[PDB]
DNA sequence: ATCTTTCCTATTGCTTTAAAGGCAGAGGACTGTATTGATCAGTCCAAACTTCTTTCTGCATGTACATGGAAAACTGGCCAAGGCAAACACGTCCGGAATGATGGTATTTAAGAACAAACATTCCCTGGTATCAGCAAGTACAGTGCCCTGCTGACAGA
DNA sequence: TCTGTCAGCAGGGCACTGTACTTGCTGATACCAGGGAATGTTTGTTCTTAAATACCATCATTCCGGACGTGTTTGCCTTGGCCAGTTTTCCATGTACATGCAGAAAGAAGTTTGGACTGATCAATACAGTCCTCTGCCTTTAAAGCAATAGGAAAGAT
């Protein structure tokens, strides 16, 4: 039941296929950590922000309206999910 | 002999693909790993609506793919084709991050 | 001009559940910088109260503190079978920040990772490193303390990775060289001319910025011993 | 004698809501009184940004030989037009992917 | 009973049957476009908002509404939303 | 399958004060995407109406215009000596843009610099700039128009600067190229293989990206001649 | 007889005399002091009142407060400038 | 009959004014009610943000042996500080220039 | 009356000082026409912001509290003025 | 033979004299000037505070000092120490500029 | 190691900006009533979590090697440093006028209340767009073969 | 006995052919968007009240223009140092392409959790009138800071 170690769930293919859709032709090898890191930074910014507008509502399930928030409060506004 | 494309061209090959679709790139069940992970050193017992991962998901892999064509034109101005992650980390500084 | 910091209590007997006050005077004003530790014996401190009345996470409401000014006090309620240790008063309201004596009772993740023993000639230079993780490596101060069975916990300096800030006690200038590295999270206690009187426990401790933040974290300490 | 109502939509010539928009704007906290005149702008102003980027995503959609619009051709609309890719400079599209385009220096020779 | 939810969607359908009558829109299509019409309408309410406190009025008129959209819409969108603005009144205030 | 635009009065004659009404007929609907010009002889054309019913900026609400669907009329109420000019209407529905005829009237800071005349051989290609100020740059697109004696007016193509997205008319495809550079803020306009029928004026024009905007600004056109 | 301008000039001064009771300041610092208490005083109640709109609640009360706290401040300030509100909410509850 | 008026700052233990913050957010627009415990709460975290900037503030003044705080210092104080940096980071202070800061590559050798 | 040609007011000196604040040692010559048209811009910016503000409120005079809620609405807050 | 310091030296000691001090580095009047010059095309006949002339210096020297070394973090990313327009054109791409 | 230049430090004067003191009005506090938003206990079903089972498809590992990155060297030219003359920025002072603020009237317009009904949301159904699969058709990549140009050994002229 | 020139060989460059990938058409089908139907709740209409705002006059505060004088800053020119750009080489490190394993995906069922509606109710906040005292504007004093002068020490260049 505790999760210790997903973040090497972001695969190297993965990884490689976000680059590609940016634009890049080649990658250096210790590009995958850096990204990871990145990832993991990103994410828990924003589920910190999910999490407490979950709480203030007094609620236990963290609903898209929540990330819509928590996105939107950092100027990463997402369309397409009840905004 | 078999035959073999030159290094870079399955690389151009593969940008156009990833430009041309728009599905997620990373997959869905340990992405949502990862975000019950996180999320359990907030609150303990948390749930998640499947629409709020796949929100989270399309955050993330758009934040990504911005980072990497920033990383991209790093690395160019270096007068280099390989990213590296000095250029992610200069790309994070200058805008800010 | 360093602030002479002076527990009443040197020592104390107390049995189970019966409630306990250390008093802690100060030299001079502070204004309520004020921290409690609980130290056992062969392991780090661990704060009680900061701010001269604010409990640490984790410390049970067992424990009081109070006061502001020169006098402090502290209180524990209900004693504990593990409550005995020693305790000390932290006053960081000035630059060079001091210890108590040490009050020594008896009855009837953030985490910081520090190196083992290490057994050094005299004359020569150690650098025992302080690996943090669990927070925002750079969001933190790493504070610097000796601890010596003669002349207790004494403050050496601190670095701030944000911007590699440093401050040392003047009893350390130029004994000590704090450093960072951002890249691995570590920093680096660099000890030159070594003698005698250096043979003590290092303990590298987490500190906020912020000015009513106190040392919360603890490393296990370096035990550093001089032939 | 009542009169029959009639729709301030249909008054102002509009397609969006009028008294929605004024009672959004009531409803929003925005200010102790809002004007007769000011719904009736900012629906008129939310029905053109709309038709703006519905008939360039239809351009779009037709260019691909498509008969529906989806967030394929929203992103398409929006990131070809230099003003409305300011306006929505700091907005993600799900499943609207990004433009096709490769730094030159990466191309072969 | 469960609590009715309020959309843009037959609004934003009607404007794209006036623009392209043959084409469709996706319901994803149609859920960016709610999301894109909350928020402009956000963008601009605040902005009245924040020039009518600025002068210290108690209301919001049009002129609020035109000043926030020229400050938000950029180049040619801000005359041409202006132009369809102050079109919309002047036909709702000779009815 | 292109959209013919027919002008039923072909030339008119009036006095000064007296009210004229010049009417534009489309083949296939439009839905209110036309523009109304007027051409001094030898002057860049002006914009009069654009949407069908907008003033265009600067000018007096003399003029007046009407009409949806496929029937569009321009309106003239106090003529003047200054009304003496060729008026065209312009549509923009769809994707190759068609001028009107023309209608031949007579009475009894944005800039767009152009290259002046130039003369060349048949058989070889010109390369004519439009250097545009006093506006962002990328945000219009620089439309391309043809006017020949015998053929009117004809829309060639644009590039878009953002982008450098281009769109060319179907009969001009390959004869002509169009290329920007953002540095010098300059469109070019490439003329390969030159013929007899390509000597006319070619005019360089601002259009906004916008759907209902039309082409605002002109250039004083470069005239182009094949022995 | 001339308008009269708020400012937090005297509660600025009186917690610098309360911090540092011999260090005097400026004008043009007190004024820079004022522009970022209103700043922080609009940024703590925008996010109270979008908290209020999104939970269909009429009231900002200090729990709307201490989330907005909570989300606007960063690190260890959010939790001292916590425990300060919830102090004083306290003291004055028990007046 | 009434008894002594006392001011609700006082109440609170506060120094910045719990009545004027209540009006301010009566008068702001931000929703139809406010609590009574809110202006409390929001008087003592602008108290807090402000003693914290000050005391910083007054350190390094003290440091430049100066006895008035300046905007220098209060640019010193927050740009030395990695979360009032973070909150500040989109502020410019006026007459607060910048940290000394070069970087290592452009030193001589 | 009227001004022409002011942008040549930012001296080649004043530019250096700003980037010597800014950590520069060594500088291009081409850097002058480059900093001369961003600050331009940036100018404009801010000047277009500000006299809308300046108009809606009826105004003719430009006031302080223009140019601050101005370079508010750009992500640009300064302090020092608010008053 | 008259004393010259090395290049580069003026250099540094320019850095950290500009870095100590908080003074408008650009001369008033002709900033002025400029903003007038600008807000004619907005607005003719308009009046301009002093304090708003001085927001607009402050607003304008600070960006410009950000921008400055954010160039000169990508001039040192290509291993050079002279910053050239491109420096500048990728600072602000990055930005978002 | 020595000479030159810059910065930093320490008096003394004077300058100006911060700090103290006083008055009034407007705004904050006190008390009571109305009422309205919000709390608390039940219930239901929409949806989230958990487990199983194919079914692959994608990930992981390993091998060959092509080529991009990094180091070294070398030079031209582009920018730093300094000198001197002139420009014009800074200070300051006064005249004039354009503009902002205040006050009183009157004048338009928006809040509030009650009722009818008409518009919008949720359910249901279906058929046309779009997805998937197989087969040509076009495009472009990579390698090989034929033709071509410059360098070097042996011949011919001197 | 010495030196220039020609045929053979090394190195380049263009054209042809095999091959892999992506696109285009046709056919089948499956699943998502659009049209028709009932309810509820939200918008429109009418009248009254009051309050926010236009307009008009006046005063006075502040901005623009100009004028002069001093002296610091900018512009231009010269010299030369060192740095950006180019060329060469090498190697290590990413790319491309097998093959096999396993877990991600999807359908299904079962269990369970909790979000939201409903009703009762109750604690807190708006509103009103009154009193009073706290804060902003005006005025006057003095102490921190700026400027000028001189001396010492650190650092750059030789």
Same mark, same amino acid.
């Given at each position: 039941?505790?999760?210790?170690?997903?973040?090497?769930?972001?695969?190297?293919?993965?990884?490689?296929?976000?680059?590609?859709?940016?634009?890049?032709?080649? $990658?250096?090898?210790?590009?995958?950590?850096?990204?990871?890191?990145?990832?993991?930074?990103?994410?828990?910014?924003? $589920?910190?922000?999910?999490?407490?507008?979950?709480?203030?509502?007094?609620?236990?399930?963290?609903?898209?309206?929540?990330?819509?928030?928590?996105?939107?409060?950092?100027?990463?506004?997402?369309?397409?999910?009840?905004? | 002999?078999?035959?073999?494309?030159?290094?870079?061209?399955?690389?151009?090959?593969?940008?156009?693909?990833?430009?041309?679709?728009?599905?997620?790139?990373?997959?869905?069940?340990?992405?949502?790993?990862?975000?019950?992970?996180?999320?359990?050193?907030?609150?303990?017992?948390?749930?998640?609506?499947?629409?709020?991962?796949?929100?989270?998901?399309?955050?993330?892999?758009?934040?990504?793919?911005?980072?990497?064509?920033?990383?991209?034109?790093?690395?160019?101005?270096?007068?280099?084709?390989?990213?590296?992650?000095?250029?992610?980390?200069?790309?994070?500084?200058?805008?800010?991050? | 001009?360093?602030?002479?910091?002076?527990?009443?209590?040197?020592?104390?007997?107390?049995?189970?559940?019966?409630? +306990?006050?250390?008093?802690?005077?100060?030299?001079?004003?502070?204004?309520?910088?004020?921290?409690?530790?609980?130290?056992k014996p062969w392991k780090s401190p661990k704060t009680?109260?900061?701010?001269?009345?604010?409990?640490?996470?984790? +410390?049970?409401?067992?424990?009081?503190?109070?006061?502001?000014?020169?006098?402090?006090?502290?209180?524990?309620?209900?004693?504990?079978?593990?409550?005995?240790?020693?305790?000390?008063?932290?006053?960081?309201?000035?630059?060079?920040?001091?210890?108590?004596?040490?009050?020594?009772?008896?009855?009837?993740?953030?985490?910081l990772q520090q190196s083992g023993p290490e057994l050094?000639?005299?004359?020569?230079?150690?650098?025992?490193?302080?690996?943090?993780?669990?927070?925002?490596?750079?969001?933190?101060?790493?504070?610097?303390?000796?601890?010596?069975?003669?002349?207790?916990?004494?403050?050496?300096?601190?670095?701030?990775?944000?911007?590699?800030?440093?401050?040392?006690?003047?009893?350390?200038?130029?004994?000590?060289?704090?450093?960072?590295?951002?890249?691995?999270?570590?920093?680096?206690?660099?000890?030159?001319?070594?003698?005698?009187?250096?043979?003590?426990?290092?303990?590298?401790?987490?500190?906020?910025?912020?000015?009513?933040?106190?040392?919360?974290?603890?490393?296990?300490?370096?035990?550093?011993?001089?032939? | 004698?009542?009169?029959?109502?009639?729709?301030?939509?249909?008054?102002?010539?509009?397609?969006?809501?009028?008294?929605?928009?004024?009672?959004?704007?009531?409803?929003?906290?925005?200010?102790?009184?809002?004007?007769?005149?000011?719904?009736?702008?900012?629906?008129?102003?939310?029905?053109?940004?709309?038709?703006?980027?519905?008939?360039?995503?239809?351009?779009?959609?037709?260019?691909?030989?498509?008969?529906?619009?989806?967030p394929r051709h929203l992103q398409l609309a929006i990131?070809?037009?230099?003003?409305?890719?300011?306006?929505?400079?700091?907005?993600?599209?799900?499943?609207?992917?990004?433009?096709?385009?490769?730094?030159?220096?990466?191309?072969?020779? | 009973?469960?609590?009715?939810?309020?959309?843009?969607?037959?609004?934003?359908?009607?404007?794209?049957?006036?623009?392209?009558?043959?084409?469709?829109?996706?319901?994803?299509?149609?859920?960016?476009?709610?999301?894109?019409?909350?928020?402009?309408?956000?963008?601009?309410?605040?902005?009245?908002?924040?020039?009518?406190?600025?002068?210290?009025?108690? *209301?919001? *008129?049009?002129?609020?509404?035109?000043?926030?959209?020229?400050?938000?819409?950029?180049?040619?969108?801000?005359?041409?939303?202006?132009?369809?603005? *102050?079109?919309?009144?002047?036909?709702? *205030?000779?009815?």
């Amino acid at each position: 039941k505790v999760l210790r170690d997903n973040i090497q769930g972001i695969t190297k293919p993965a990884i490689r296929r976000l680059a590609r859709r940016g634009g890049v032709k080649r $990658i250096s090898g210790l590009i995958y950590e850096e990204t990871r890191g990145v990832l993991k930074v990103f994410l828990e910014n924003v $589920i910190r922000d999910a999490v407490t507008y979950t709480e203030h509502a007094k609620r236990k399930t963290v609903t898209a309206m929540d990330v819509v928030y928590a996105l939107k409060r950092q100027g990463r506004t997402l369309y397409g999910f009840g905004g | 002999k078999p035959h073999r494309y030159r290094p870079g061209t399955v690389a151009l090959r593969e940008i156009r693909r990833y430009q041309k679709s728009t599905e997620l790139l990373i997959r869905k069940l340990p992405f949502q790993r990862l975000v019950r992970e996180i999320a359990q050193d907030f609150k303990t017992d948390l749930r998640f609506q499947s629409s709020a991962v796949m929100a989270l998901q399309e955050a993330c892999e758009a934040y990504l793919v911005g980072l990497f064509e920033d990383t991209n034109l790093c690395a160019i101005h270096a007068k280099r084709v390989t990213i590296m992650p000095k250029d992610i980390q200069l790309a994070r500084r200058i805008r800010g991050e | 001009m360093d602030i002479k910091m002076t527990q009443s209590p040197s020592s104390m007997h107390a049995s189970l559940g019966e409630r +306990v006050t250390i008093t802690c005077k100060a030299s001079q004003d502070i204004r309520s910088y004020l921290s409690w530790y609980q130290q056992k014996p062969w392991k780090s401190p661990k704060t009680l109260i900061y701010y001269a009345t604010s409990l640490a996470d984790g +410390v049970p409401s067992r424990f009081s503190g109070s006061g502001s000014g020169q006098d402090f006090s502290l209180t524990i309620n209900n004693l504990e079978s593990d409550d005995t240790a020693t305790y000390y008063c932290l006053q960081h309201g000035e630059s060079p920040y001091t210890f108590g004596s040490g009050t020594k009772l008896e009855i009837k993740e953030v985490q910081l990772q520090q190196s083992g023993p290490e057994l050094v000639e005299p004359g020569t230079s150690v650098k025992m490193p302080c690996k943090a993780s669990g927070y925002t490596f750079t969001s933190y101060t790493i504070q610097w303390v000796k601890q010596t069975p003669r002349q207790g916990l004494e403050w050496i300096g601190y670095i701030y990775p944000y911007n590699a800030g440093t401050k040392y006690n003047e009893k350390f200038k130029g004994k000590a060289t704090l450093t960072s590295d951002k890249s691995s999270s570590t920093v680096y206690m660099e000890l030159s001319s070594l003698t005698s009187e250096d043979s003590a426990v290092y303990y590298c401790a987490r500190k906020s910025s912020r000015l009513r933040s106190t040392l919360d974290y603890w490393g296990q300490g370096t035990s550093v011993t001089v032939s | 004698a009542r009169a029959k109502a009639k729709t301030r939509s249909s008054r102002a010539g509009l397609q969006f809501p009028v008294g929605r928009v004024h009672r959004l704007l009531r409803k929003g906290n925005y200010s102790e009184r809002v004007g007769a005149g000011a719904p009736v702008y900012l629906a008129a102003v939310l029905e053109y940004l709309t038709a703006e980027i519905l008939e360039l995503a239809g351009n779009a959609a037709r260019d691909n030989k498509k008969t529906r619009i989806i967030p394929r051709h929203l992103q398409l609309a929006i990131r070809n037009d230099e003003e409305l890719n300011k306006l929505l400079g700091r907005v993600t599209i799900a499943q609207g992917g990004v433009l096709p385009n490769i730094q030159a220096v990466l191309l072969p020779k | 009973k469960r609590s009715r939810k309020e959309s843009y969607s037959i609004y934003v359908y009607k404007v794209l049957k006036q623009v392209h009558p043959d084409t469709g829109i996706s319901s994803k299509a149609m859920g960016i476009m709610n999301s894109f019409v909350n928020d402009i309408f956000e963008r601009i309410a605040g902005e009245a908002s924040r020039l009518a406190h600025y002068n210290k009025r108690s *209301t919001i *008129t049009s002129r609020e509404i035109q000043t926030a959209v020229r400050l938000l819409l950029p180049g040619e969108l801000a005359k041409h939303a202006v132009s369809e603005g *102050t079109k919309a009144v002047t036909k709702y *205030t000779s009815a």
